[PDB]
Paper text:
At present, the best structurally characterized pLGIC is the G. violaceus ligand-gated ion channel (GLIC), of prokaryotic origin. However, the GLIC is a pH-gated channel, activated by lowering the pH, with a maximal activation at pH 4 and a pH50 around 5. We instead found that proton activation is a complex multiple loci mechanism, with the key contribution stemming from the coupling interface between the extracellular and transmembrane domain, with E35 acting as a key proton-sensing residue.
The mutant of the vestibular pair on the β5 strand, D86N-D88N, yields a significant decrease in pH50 greater than 1 pH unit. All residues were also tested individually, with most mutations having no significant effect, although a large majority tend to decrease the pH50 (notably D86N/A, D88N/A, and D91N). Mutation of Asp/Glu residues at the complementary (−) face, in general, decreased the proton sensitivity of the GLIC, with additive effects in many cases, especially for D88 and D86. However, the pattern of phenotypes does not allow discriminating whether those residues are involved in proton sensing or gating, because mutations to Asn/Gln also produced decreased proton sensitivity. The key mutants at E26, D86, and D88 were solved at pH 4, each showing a structure similar to that of the Wt.
Residue numbers in the entry:
A (entry chain E), B (entry chain A), C (entry chain B), D (entry chain D), E (entry chain C): 5 to 315
């Protein structure tokens, strides 16, 4: 079979639509998500046209093998989509209405800069390669674009599923390619991060500051070193849920900065002890009293500065 | 092949039934479960009708290829089900009896609010898309819905497997869709959580309270900080067996609240020491004596309040 | 094709046999094992009968497509077995000899009560559904049932591979089903558990008891708390190699009971200190001296009681 | 079908080109990467030649089955590539233009010596086996070799994608093989390693050195031992992201060397205590004062030496 | 198609050869390795013989479907190999030369007794089942057995790839089977184990022995208990990279024995303290002084004994 013939020199328009059924498995480390959707295609083939009076029928059904079907592929998929044809229906003028249900693992990159308070735009790129007979261009049939109400992406809120109606038409290996951009806008459910990582991490930091109300070096060393180890465990736990980024993430910045607070607390604890031993407890008292205000104030201001730079 | 013709303008009723053989791999993090069952279908095709006297046979067997079979799909499956046809049998009036054995990874969401004392309703949604010739509606043949006695879901108790007999009929891409709801009611086997997480977590908390019968700051700091680290390990262990929820789980609440008890214990230990050093051990004694009663009482009441809110 | 016709009213007997080649991947958490075996089938089809004088050949070979083959399935498999036909040989009377080599992930439950000193009976269930023409019954050809000598299941000892010769004939969805039980008896290689978990766990417990020969509260607190944390790590390590059971396992019981010994050791250490501070070291000495005998004796007796209840 | 016949005794030249679409999943432990690209092939088959005047058409399209296609394979792939034919176009002289889209898991080894400041050359080897009729030789059509601008390899910077134009022609299993080398030059994004591993590891080391300004043995023992354990955690974390190499990696060397600094710090702390107890605090003071300069200076010089040897 | 006919009563000899292209993924826990190789087969079929003068051609190429091909299988593979036919060439006398490229996950057991200083012999077993027409026997064509120079197995050194030329001919299910043994001899690259596990483990042990130069019970308790916990972490890390063996491994023995050294160090530290408290520091001094020599000497001798028993 060959592609439909042109009336003039016009390209063949394949109208498209994606309707998401199931959306799942958003892997932050891999920057992939799995999709299960309907893919609808529509184009005119005059060779398939018929008289509804003479033929009796209003529409004719065909098996994929019987007629010409455009070779539509996804750009950013990992492997070729798993698809099963639902229906192929031809109207009297020759307008073909194709429907298939597919599943694919889509590879769309993520911006972790504001993690875990980030929003993403996942992409699904549809493409078509022009044949030698005639050039093929993609279009968006907006009535055949949508998502099921049940569509749930665990740990995420689905905001919108829309399509950029104008295709990106370009040359590739000396043939025209027509690319379409389907955008799924989502925003992370940050709630769990608060009682599981953020508040536990702040509690251990504040426990380290109880050393500013203690003269016992042995006890202070235990307080600041033990809590520093718990902070290392939280840093490790966090960096496992995320990929290695060439930029600083919001959580990454706070986690990093907190190390400096532990380091300065060890210095203060060491200075206090050295002074007490050197028979200068009055000077050590001044430093300890100042630290009680300095540490919380500097922590609070540094956090205002960070939140400002990131949001 | 085309769908059976209507006697009048009535839709075609496809009677369904699911009989579970093997039920396994309930992933809490992924909110998926694997199923291995029989899918039975039954509809009338008058074109297949025959006289049992003339034909000799009481029933005729056909290969899927030979006759029209409705395109039945699962909504909430991850990928398309793995199915193998067991039998296709036609009675003299034209009643077709289809049977296939399938396996699928079903995606049904879970409510972790009462975890690990939770009960779930897993769903299996059967659907059918109407063709242009005629509208197709699903039905439940209750005699062909069940489960094997051996059916075991590790760490869960299987309560019931029933079907919501009235389908959810709706329009999708300007064609009628008939959806059916098969519900598998299960309840978690919480037993293991008690000697592995709950009791170990309470033991370490009670060990931290032995600091209220000690005047040694160095020993108290060690007692409260060491046990806090073991609590962090239990929080991490628990949050690995579960997905990130936009709500508070029962275990999540208890785990979180216990951090506050550790934080207040550090404050008491710090106050006691500061007072002893300031030559006020009588005042420190009053606070320590009070804490011995306050901590267990507040812990017990706070837990009554939590159990009340969650159950 | 249709099933062979009966000489009288007798059912069709399909003789079976399983010969294990490779046995591997016993997942305790999943209660699955992988198998690679030969499945042999034999039945008589008079329609295939031939004269060896006229045909030249003594036996005729056929492709599965060419003749009727019974639809034999496994009950407790995860997905449908991967099978490849080795041979199909027909003798002049019409006796078909089918041979295939398959691989499958079998789902057979396990009893962890005596873990890691447990023995299991893995099951492989073969089944056949009767057709409308005639009822099909399974049989065991004992000469075609066995296992290779090289068959090794990592961390397990293979005791026997036998078949329950009488099939379970029952009704399912108004058709006769003939089920056969192939049993693989295995016993765990507990050896590694002793130097890796049991002895390390006992060493840390005995180290905690060196606190009964020490008057230093600060040192005792460190001894009992540090070793308790190592016990938590062993509890976590053990519960990762096992699924969540609605019963107590042998190792589970010992691990749990050892927490009580740590809890009572913390109480003794606290009492000793309180008494020494209260200027009653004589009474504290009596308690400490008693604990030196009490702790090992109670530990030894409690273990005799547990081993008795479990074995 | 047979291969094209030679005009004379010349070999058949198959012109090749790889255009990367998606590049992903670089596993450092496995030394694999996944690729999704276009494979373009071109060769002359005089048997396919036609007159454009007589035939009407300028090019003829064929199904893979209709004509002879060279059996092109990848050497260093894990399993055989997943490929789907995009187009096959024949020009009047008989020049065939083949295009397929494929995906494969490529196995190319990595040099971790300068990790995480390393650069790699990933290889994709195309090969062809000569037939008895005639020898087949590969070539590079440079206009059909490239990569998409969107091509992103997480945690890596893609420098270049080029081909070694002259094939490696050699004998294998008594037939000529023509191998081509496609090279993807990449360099690691080391940025994340600095705030997550390098700086945290240096902070804990510097904290251990605060023991040179402390006379408290109990506090020093806690400082040096606790920080050594955090260093062990970083060593374990690092060796999980990497395979077992028969050489020393850059990070491996630094991590190893830091153990020696911890060991010498324990010796100093032990010596200081022994001397103070032996009533020689003046000598212990000299050693402690010297260590304050020695440790940072030796650490800084040893690091200059290492960076020099590795870069 | 039927197998070639015998000239007399001789069996049919199928000459074999395996040439490794890529060798990868040696899983110690699973006792599996993945292979990507060429499988060459050669046998004589007189029915395929032709006169090179009359036919013009020197060799005839055939599609697998056209001629009889022996059913060759691998014994110790996990699932059936993935294979693709490269070439089939028939010489004038009827000698068939078959070539296919395959990939398989091979299950060959490992001996961890000398781990990580162990050497292994991986096996690839080729087998053939005799048909009723005639018995089939395997042979090794040594010129068609080999491996690529690039063949690299990460963390291993590939020593040799040879075949045991005499097949194992035996009866199985009343038919002859011809098994061949292909042996891949490899030896572990132990280098990484030294700076990552062995030396870190020895450093922490030697740190525990600094307690023999300290009179501070509180410091000693911290030194010996903290280092014991780091030893537990190394034991856990090691037992994760290995399966559960019914024998003692070399590393397993050293790791186990080191626990006894920690246990005796706790006893010495406890004895020293009890004696100092009992006002017997002179006796405690004798024990401590002796331990300084005893511990290193006994450690060194015990290790000589172990290395002797294992190597
Ligand atoms: C002279 C003291 C020898 C101690 C030997 C202890 C051997 C224990 C063997 C356990 C085998 C399983 C059960 C733990 C006992 C801890 C020993 C504490 C020793 C205190 C010594 C006091 C100095 C007089
Ligand atoms: C505690 C410290 C444990 C150190 C263990 C030493 C290694 C050993 O003794 O290992 C033994 C292996 C033997 O190698 P083989 O070829 O299998 O000898 C087989 C000999 N037969 C056939 C005669 C029996 O020697 C090595 O690899 C030596 C280099 C490693 C040194 C690592 C030191 C750290
Ligand atoms: Cl696609
Ligand atoms: Cl489905
Ligand atoms: Cl509606
Ligand atoms: Cl409709
Ligand atoms: Cl099966
Ligand atoms: Cl390939
Ligand atoms: Cl195989
Ligand atoms: Na088509
Ligand atoms: Na059909
Ligand atoms: Na059949
Ligand atoms: Na071809
Ligand atoms: Na064949
Ligand atoms: Na301590």
């Amino acid at each position: 079979v060959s592609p439909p013939p042109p009336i003039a020199d016009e390209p063949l328009t394949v109208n498209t639509g994606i309707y998401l059924i199931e959306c799942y498995s958003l892997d932050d480390k891999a920057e992939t998500f799995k999709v299960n959707a309907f893919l609808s295609l529509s184009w005119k083939d005059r060779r398939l046209a018929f008289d509804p009076v003479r033929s009796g029928v209003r529409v004719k059904t065909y098996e994929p093998e019987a007629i010409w079907i455009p070779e539509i592929r996804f750009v950013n998929v990992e492997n070729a989509r798993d698809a099963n044809v639902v229906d192929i229906s031809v109207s009297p003028d020759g307008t073909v209405q194709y429907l298939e249900r597919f599943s694919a693992r889509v590879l769309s990159p993520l911006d972790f800069r504001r993690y875990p308070f980030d929003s993403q735009t996942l992409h699904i790129y549809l493409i078509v390669r022009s044949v030698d007979t005639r050039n093929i261009v993609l279009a968006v049939d907006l009535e055949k674009v949508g998502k099921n109400d049940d569509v749930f992406l665990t740990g995420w809120d689905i905001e919108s599923f829309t399509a950029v109606v104008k295709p990106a038409n370009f040359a590739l290996e000396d043939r025209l390619e027509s690319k379409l951009d389907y955008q799924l806008r989502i925003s992370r459910q940050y709630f769990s991060y608060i009682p599981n990582i953020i508040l536990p991490m702040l509690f251990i930091l504040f426990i380290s500051w109880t050393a500013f109300w203690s003269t016992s070096y042995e006890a202070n060393v235990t307080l600041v070193v033990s809590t520093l180890i718990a902070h290392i465990a939280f840093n490790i736990l966090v960096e496992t849920n995320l990929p290695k980024t060439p930029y600083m993430t919001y959580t990454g910045a706070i986690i990093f900065m907190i190390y400096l607070f532990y380091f300065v607390a060890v210095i203060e604890v060491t200075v206090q002890h050295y002074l007490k031993v050197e028979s200068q407890p009055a000077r050590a008292a001044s430093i300890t009293r100042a630290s009680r205000i300095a540490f919380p104030v500097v922590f609070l201001l540094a956090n205002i500065i960070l939140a400002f730079l990131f949001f």
